[PDB]
Amino acid sequence: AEEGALVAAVEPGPLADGAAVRLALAGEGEACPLLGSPGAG
């Protein structure tokens, strides 16, 4: 009775892919601070 059953191969059907999300900072700079006062005699 060889027709009893069959072997079956399983696959994951609905696969999906996506891209990674990376953060970045736009622009850069630095304003100078102020300091100092004169000594006296």
Binding site: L34, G36, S37, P38
Partner: protein
């Protein structure tokens, strides 16, 4: 004399020793200070400048 001899109410003021400080006595009679501060100037320039 000594410090205690001066009356309390007078001790609050200047006390001069004789004859050591007779110059101070003369100056006080003239209402003059032995040391006088020099005249004031203007405030210093706030020269704050960037680094």
């Amino acid at each position: 004399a000594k410090k205690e001899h001066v009356p309390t109410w007078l001790q609050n003021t200047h006390v001069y020793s004789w004859p050591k400080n007779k110059k101070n006595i003369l100056l006080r009679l003239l209402r003059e200070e032995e040391f006088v501060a020099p005249p004031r100037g203007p405030l210093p320039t706030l020269q704050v400048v960037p680094l």
